[PDB]
Design a protein around this ligand. Structure first.
Ligand code: NAG
Ligand code: NAG
Ligand code: NAG
Ligand code: NAG
Ligand code: CA
Ligand code: CA
Ligand code: MN
Ligand code: MN
Lengths: 237, 237
């Protein structure tokens, strides 16, 4: 089976998408994961967007695990340079029927008081105690304490292109981040066996968070917009 | 609501119980959680016994959480005093349809690669890197790194009586361990809010494991028998 879908731009009322929390689709065809009021991003926000149908990542019957490729472009604009923007966005795969986890440095996917399995790639903008120098991309398996990290220099307000490919044969998850206006290229990879971590069917989508009010700094925010998104996966057996 | 059950001793073919892995009920009416062949407890063992029907620990419509009490007697016999007996047993509450996680110091409940929520009381006999002096009673919330612990001196081969009470009105989980032959009393308590951790309906039961072959020490074993077990829960709403 080969599932595929492509969004060159999002539209309002889109059937194949499931918005959660603050996430909404603007008139301009941009998916804003977090809250922006008349051009200014707000703190204390969290939002997610999921493809409305689950995809089969592997089969128990055959033991085969699906390969997949996903591509998307995003934009993170940081208006208040000081004291520190927050928190970041992530592409994630998690079991179906899940609710938004905690925000902040958890991105709306990780809840320490009610854990569930998840694999996710993060573009992190705030340096928590469990984090290395920001910004950095990170591969996360069940936790926000990344297995692998690589720092990057954000194109503030610019466009970022991302390619994430998973090869069943090698169990390699490889991630590409490009900032076209800047010419910069960032690469990061790790072995992840989707079978020992996730159930047969999952949900794919994005999650983002802006500073938590418990920080007392309202200038800890930024936008987390998605411009386009396509996904393809193949399960032989 | 008020579910209630009691086992003075276990009878083979017990319909209200649900054994998993190595766990089994012997002729003498004892429920042996881990493997013992002709009186000799063997390493590399993991077993679980769960009550057949799921209990409702809380209500979303009303917001009411249940109070419960459970009492049981166990026996841990350590035939090989050296190099070190292992690993222990636990009473635990987890989401329905759970699967026997990792053995060893994870007691057949925790599974790092595929987390799920659980609340448990362990009686730990092996000192892992995350553990303090053994043996000790410990309260576990979603992980084997206890929130609160207390040490105890085991009556090797003897009978232990345990009382576990949860008061919804205060979220106090209180634990009592008595070794009758010795006259010793160990007590431990912590604040635990079942609503922030578990779903409305869970499964209640026991789990135990003997040393893992990864330690390369066949002597890291002991018995983990359950003599009797009563349980009462009351959900006002
Ligand atoms: C932050 O947002 C959450 C959910 O939208 C709300 O509970 C909270 O009161 C909001 N405001 C502040 C200042 O915390
Ligand atoms: C230990 O026991 C398990 C389950 O019975 C088995 O699969 C494994 O190969 C055993 N290994 C050793 C060294 O005993
Ligand atoms: C294993 O236990 C037996 C019984 O006490 C003992 O004779 C043997 O040499 C022990 N092995 C170690 C490493 O202590
Ligand atoms: C926050 O952002 C505004 C807008 O840039 C700036 O004038 C202010 O002093 C910044 N610093 C803090 C600590 O809020
Ligand atoms: Ca962070
Ligand atoms: Ca231990
Ligand atoms: Mn991070
Ligand atoms: Mn312990």
């Amino acid at each position: 089976k080969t599932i595929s879908f492509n969004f060159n731009q999002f539209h309002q009322n889109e059937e194949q998408l499931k918005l959660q929390r603050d996430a909404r689709i603007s008139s301009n065809s941009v998916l804003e994961l977090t809250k922006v009021v008349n051009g200014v991003p707000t703190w204390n926000s969290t939002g997610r967007a999921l493809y409305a149908k689950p995809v089969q990542v592997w089969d128990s019957t055959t033991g085969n695990v699906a390969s997949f490729e996903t591509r998307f472009s995003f934009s993170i604009r940081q208006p208040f340079p000081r004291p520190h923007p927050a928190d970041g966005l992530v592409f994630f795969i998690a079991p179906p029927n899940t609710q938004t986890g905690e925000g902040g440095g958890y991105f709306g996917i990780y809840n320490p008081l009610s854990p569930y399995p998840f694999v996710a790639v993060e573009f992190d903008t705030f340096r928590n105690t469990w984090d290395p120098q920001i910004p950095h991309i990170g591969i996360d398996v069940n936790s926000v304490i990344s297995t692998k990290t690589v720092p990057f220099t954000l194109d503030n307000g610019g466009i970022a292109n991302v390619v994430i490919k998973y090869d069943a044969s090698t169990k390699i998850l490889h991630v590409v981040l490009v900032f076209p206006s800047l010419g910069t290229i960032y690469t990061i990879a790790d072995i992840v066996d989707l079978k020992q971590v996730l159930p047969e069917s999952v949900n794919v989508g994005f999650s983002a968070a802006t500073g938590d009010p418990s920080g007392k700094q309202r200038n800890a925010t930024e936008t987390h917009d998605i411009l386009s998104w396509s996904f393809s996966a193949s399960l032989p057996g």
